[PDB]
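Crash report, auto-generated. Payload:
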Amino acid sequence: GPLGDGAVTLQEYLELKKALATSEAKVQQLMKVNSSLSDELRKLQREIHKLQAENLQLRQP
Amino acid sequence: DGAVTLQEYLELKKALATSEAKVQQLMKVNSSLSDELRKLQREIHKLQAENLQLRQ
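Recovered output after restart:
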């Protein structure tokens, strides 16, 4: 980047690099949480399979 | 050189905008995943309650 009197100051450059790093970190965190949530989704779906099977047996006269 | 610095800065701004769009898309899908997990949990609980009623 520039040295600490042009169109882009060193402070502007550093602030932009930090904003990009912050946004990239947030993408990584979103991907980690979405992976965890996607695994949880499958577990909860399986719990419905379990209870649906029980429900159908209980209803059978 | 100031022209080179300007171009580097503008490319970084474009990268930031692209990253922000990706964050917004992943937030959208996070929210949908979260809504669907809450819905499944409510459906599990309704089946659990109905099954216990069928036993009474």
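Post-recovery validation: Chain A has one domain: 1-61.
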